[PDB]
Paper text:
Laccases belong to multicopper oxidases, a widespread class of enzymes implicated in many oxidative functions in pathogenesis, immunogenesis and morphogenesis of organisms and in the metabolic turnover of complex organic substances. They catalyze the coupling between the four one-electron oxidations of a broad range of substrates with the four-electron reduction of dioxygen to water.
The structure of the blue [name], a multicopper oxidase from the white-rot basidiomycete fungus Lentinus (Panus) tigrinus, involved in lignin and xenobiotics biodegradation, was solved at 1.5 Å. It exhibits a molecular architecture organized in three sequentially arranged cupredoxin-like domains; each of them has a greek key β-barrel topology, strictly related to the small copper proteins like azurin and plastocyanin and common to all the members of the blue multicopper oxidase family, like the ascorbate oxidase and the mammalian ceruloplasmin. Of the six putative N-glycosylation sites (consensus sequence N-X-T/S) only at Asn54, Asn376, and Asn435 the density maps indicate the presence of glycosilaytion. The structure is further stabilized by two sulphur bridges, one between Cys85 and Cys487 from domains 1 and 3 respectively and the other between Cys117 and Cys 205 from domains 1 and 2 correspondingly. The T1 copper ion (occupancy 0.75) presents a planar triangular coordination with two histidine (His394 and His457) and one cysteine (Cys452) residues. Exposing LtL crystals at pH 8.5 to high X-rays radiation doses under aerobic condition allowed us to detect two intermediates in the catalyzed molecular oxygen splitting, most likely corresponding to the 2-electrons and 4-electrons reduction stages. The electron-density maps from LtL disclosed two different T2/T3 cluster-dioxygen arrangements in the two [name] molecules (A and B) present into the asymmetric unit, possibly corresponding to two different reduction states of the oxygen molecule along the reduction pathway. In both molecules the T2 copper center is coordinated to His64, His397 and one OH- ligand whereas the T3 copper centers are coordinated to 3 histidine residues each (His111, His399, and His451 for T3(a), His66, His109, and His453 for T3(b)). It should be noted that differences observed among the structural data of multicopper oxidases published to date, and acquired using synchrotron radiation, are difficult to interpret since they most probably represent pictures of the copper sites resulting from the average of the starting oxidized state and of the partially/totally reduced coppers/dioxygen adduct states and strictly reliant on the acquired x-ray doses and on the other experimental conditions.
Numbering used by the authors: 1 to 498
Amino acid sequence: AVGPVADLTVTNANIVPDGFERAAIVVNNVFPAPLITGNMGDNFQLNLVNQMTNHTMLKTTSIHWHGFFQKGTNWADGPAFINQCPIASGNSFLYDFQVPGQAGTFWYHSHLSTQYCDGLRGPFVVYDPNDPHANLYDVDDESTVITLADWYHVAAKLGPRFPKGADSTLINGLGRSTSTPTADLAVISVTKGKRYRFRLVSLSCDPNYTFSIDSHQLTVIEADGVSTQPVTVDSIQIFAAQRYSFVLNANQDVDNYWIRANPNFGTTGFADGVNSAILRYDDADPVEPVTNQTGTTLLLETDLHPLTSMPVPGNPTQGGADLNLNMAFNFDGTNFFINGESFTPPTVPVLLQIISGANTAQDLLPSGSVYSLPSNSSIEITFPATTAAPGAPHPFHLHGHVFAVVRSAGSTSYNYDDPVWRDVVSTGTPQAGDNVTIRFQTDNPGPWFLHCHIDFHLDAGFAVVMAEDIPNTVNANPVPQAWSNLCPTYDALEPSNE
Ligand SMILES: *[C@@H]1O[C@H](CO)[C@@H](O[C@@H]2O[C@H](CO)[C@@H](O[C@@H]3O[C@H](CO[C@@H]4O[C@H](CO[C@@H]5O[C@H](CO)[C@@H](O)[C@H](O)[C@@H]5O)[C@@H](O)[C@H](O)[C@@H]4O)[C@@H](O)[C@H](O[C@@H]4O[C@H](CO)[C@@H](O)[C@H](O)[C@@H]4O)[C@@H]3O)[C@H](O)[C@H]2NC(C)=O)[C@H](O)[C@H]1NC(C)=O
Ligand SMILES: *[C@@H]1O[C@H](CO)[C@@H](O)[C@H](O)[C@H]1NC(C)=O
Ligand SMILES: [Ca+2]
Ligand SMILES: [Ca+2]
Ligand SMILES: [Ca+2]
Ligand SMILES: [Ca+2]
Ligand SMILES: [Ca+2]
Ligand SMILES: [Cl-]
Ligand SMILES: [Cl-]
Ligand SMILES: [Cu+2]
Ligand SMILES: [Cu+2]
Ligand SMILES: [Cu+2]
Ligand SMILES: [Cu+2]
């Protein structure tokens, strides 16, 4: 692990995580990117050193630290053309921020076009030295982080605009494709009698995964950075960019057990050990499992509740917030729309537009994609599922905030008492008549992206910007010189160096 102070050097390399070799983007020479760690409240000084050469996978980059509120450091949040211009190859840029009040399981990824799919993605864990759940487990370290990643044999800018599924599922960077049925599988080691805090991180560009471990129950204790009341289940469905911690008690026989991560589409099931890894007890032989799934209980989001009381902003009725927004989805075969408008990156990043003086949603580009939020207010946003936006279930993500999921996918109820707080939520399906509904309070001035975290959909415009407390965006987020220099440098590049 690296951090809280570290250089992250981004290069291109040929890698073979599923036994097939392809050109990719790696960080500190590895895919997934290395685990970054620190403790609650730490100052992260993460110096991104960009050495990429491959124009097809994009030579410039910008990094988002997923789930961190970035209060007062909106310029460090990462979305290209929202919070910064991209960093040029041959240059470095220091992300310098703090994580007060947060501890949990996070990740980081390129936030320029679909670049994270080509490899710039990895896990990020912030430990709590006084973790209230510490008594539930014995081991919590780099060996208990479990990443899930969809992997494509053809690069993001070379394959279909909307891929049909991934070629392999990688668990801790390893997995099999149908064409590589003997590729090395990841091994997660446990010792009989010990309890483990496994930190499950979706690095997905698109599919959700139904995750389980043969013969072992999973006690979920955290969702998207926020500690929850414990819930014991057999399987977890984890959407793109979500995170869970669960406790596993290694109380079965010394043996090998399959870890299963079944995507919603693509190559499904487990023939020849695709979509699989190995839970290997110490003292077991180094062979593949032959275990079966026995689980029957899939985690419901409605059974997730915060460990500490987190009251829901606003009145306990539909439309009961100070500002109530609905996000109406559409699609034209190529581009996605929200309330009739498709997100194309503006030339000038939204934060720099505001610094220059834009002070209404309507003076901000792209046209009709930016929403002004008043400060110190409760906000309700609904994301009704609709057949007008193919690719459901769309997992939506709000930057700068956690939010209360008052109504979850697959449920018709509204919980204003103790809903889960998290940062990525499935918006469900039109068949179920879903109308996923979130609440949050505006205490964090800055433009914050709100978008589907299926990266192919984001790149096709499925996004809006929450311009929170416009009058104090500049006051709250003083910018460093290096940030002010990004756009002039970027805009002076040849297009082939983008
Ligand atoms: C900057 O980054 C980019 C993006 O990462 C790099 O792009 C790469 O460019 C190369 C050259 O244009 C592309 O090559 C194609 O490579 C594939 C696969 O190579 C081969 O595997 C073959 C086996 O057949 C396949 O089985 C695999 C699974 O094993 C399946 O994935 C696949 O569908 C086939 O069934 C084997 O025959 C080869 O010897 C090699 O191992 C080739 O299939 C493909 O071949 C052609 O297809 C084209 C049209 O697409 C056609 O013209 C040919 O006649 C033949 O049918 C190409 O050779 C890579 O796919 C690109 N990589 C990615 C990830 O998209 C770029 O190289 C990089 N720049 C630098 C300087 O490094
Ligand atoms: C909310 O109100 C408090 C007290 O008036 C003020 O300190 C704070 O800056 C306000 N929050 C925002 C985001 O404007
Ligand atoms: Ca292309
Ligand atoms: Ca036995
Ligand atoms: Ca036994
Ligand atoms: Ca527009
Ligand atoms: Ca204010
Ligand atoms: Cl703190
Ligand atoms: Cl806030
Ligand atoms: Cu993210
Ligand atoms: Cu984010
Ligand atoms: Cu989507
Ligand atoms: Cu984002």
